[PDB]
């Protein structure tokens, strides 16, 4: 079956998926569907579909918790996160990572921070501004993730880890904190959470040596979960399976 026909066949479902996504995510996913429609090979199409699955899913996940879909090329790195949020510590950070220069660039899907206080603004910037994903409370977002791992499956499809450093009730409202999140829709679930864990237990360690509060989440969903049990609300999972997972399902049938 010809991909232009298959993409004509699910175009309606797709258009529903783009409408439930953050605006940047929707633009980015439109391209991926035009690229899939127009692919020369099942190998080229499949590679884009794999991206649209992941790209769509972060968009839904970001949408479900108040976060903003940060496209891949502009996702902040560790060094950008360190330098922007903690300039004073930036010089010390550069040192700890001298033997591990690979840690300098690690990029969480989501890099969150608690809004701190102690239109016709500037709108164009010649260089990218390293983006600030601001959340009202890391802790309250942390709570809702621990609860869902113990009922009030989820305990198996994630990890929550916090670096042990202490922050006061003024210190949480005085100082910057970091919640780093990895989300997936991969087949092998305990891979996301264990692969990242190897790097991430060590990184949380290093951020605590440098005096930064940093919080972590890894989680994943797979097709075989009950619809009422995804990390994103059940109505959303109705759309992702009907759009993107359907597009895989036909793309394994013709190849």
């Amino acid at each position, epitope marked *: 079956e010809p991909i232009a026909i298959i993409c004509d066949g699910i175009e309606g479902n797709m258009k529903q998926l783009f409408s439930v996504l953050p605006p940047d995510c929707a633009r980015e996913c439109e391209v991926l569907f035009d690229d899939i429609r127009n692919s020369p090979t099942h190998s080229t199409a499949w590679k884009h579909a794999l991206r649209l699955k992941g790209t769509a899913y972060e968009g839904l996940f970001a949408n479900c918790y108040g976060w903003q879909y940060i496209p891949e090329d502009i996702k902040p790195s560790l060094t950008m996160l360190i330098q*922007t949020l903690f*300039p*004073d510590k930036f010089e010390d950070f550069l040192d700890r990572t001298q033997l591990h220069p690979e840690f300098r660039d690690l990029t969480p899907d989501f890099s969150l*921070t608690q*809004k*701190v*206080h*102690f*239109v*016709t*603004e*500037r709108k*164009m*910037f*010649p*260089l990218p*501004e390293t*983006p*600030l994903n*601001e959340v009202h409370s890391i802790e309250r977002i942390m709570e809702n993730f621990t609860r869902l791992m113990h009922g009030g499956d989820y305990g198996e499809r994630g990890i929550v880890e916090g670096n042990h450093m202490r922050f006061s009730e003024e210190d949480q409202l005085e100082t910057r904190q970091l919640l780093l999140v990895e989300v997936g829709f991969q087949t092998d679930i305990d891979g996301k959470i264990r692969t990242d864990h190897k790097k991430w237990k060590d990184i949380l360690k290093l951020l605590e040596l440098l005096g930064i509060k940093c919080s972590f989440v890894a989680c994943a969903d797979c097709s075989s979960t009950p619809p009422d049990r995804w990390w994103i609300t059940e109505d959303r999972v109705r759309i992702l399976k009907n759009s993107v997972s359907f597009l895989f399902n036909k793309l394994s049938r013709n190849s």
Partner: antibody
Amino acid sequence: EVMLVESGAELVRPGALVDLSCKASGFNIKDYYIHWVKQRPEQGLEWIGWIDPKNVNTIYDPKFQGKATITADTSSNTAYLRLSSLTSEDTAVYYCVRDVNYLDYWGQGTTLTVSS
Amino acid sequence: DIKMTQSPLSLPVSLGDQASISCRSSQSLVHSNGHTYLHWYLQKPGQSPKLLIYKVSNRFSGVPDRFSGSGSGTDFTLKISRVEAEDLGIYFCSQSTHVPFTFGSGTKLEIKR
């Protein structure tokens, strides 16, 4: 080294027109925005506007719209400030500035005195 | 038109002393993107303004560490830990959050001798 060199008509009569230029060396100005800032002894530092050479968009302070017009030539790596309808209120030092998302490097500045 | 207000207008300090320069703005300088576009410039006599601290608290390349930028919201403080003789000049603060950019009236740093 980053350097911004402004040169322009050092004196022009009232009512006339003046073009100031800004030669950038040490960077391509396609990769930044370029600003003009006016400086007077009492009036103080006063922003004017910026130009984006990449795709040629300009944003001015409304008090200056119609007075100022920033244009740019990326091939010769220069931006221009045209001030028209000159008065004494236009007698000032003028700087062009590099925009990296914040203004960081400034030129030596060219002086303009408007009289006959 | 964010108003930028600098106090004191004049700051006589003795070499090796600490100087405090305050910049206050008409509105919050916090961008919706979460950044703050308030910056400190020093124009030595008869030179052009040179950038010290960008976005509240970042030293510009080649800028000594005795220069430190603090503040949030609308209240900002620039501090010089050890006043030196070369540090003469007028210190300007500037917001680049809102169009039009606006600059303070200036703090004249003098040296006691």
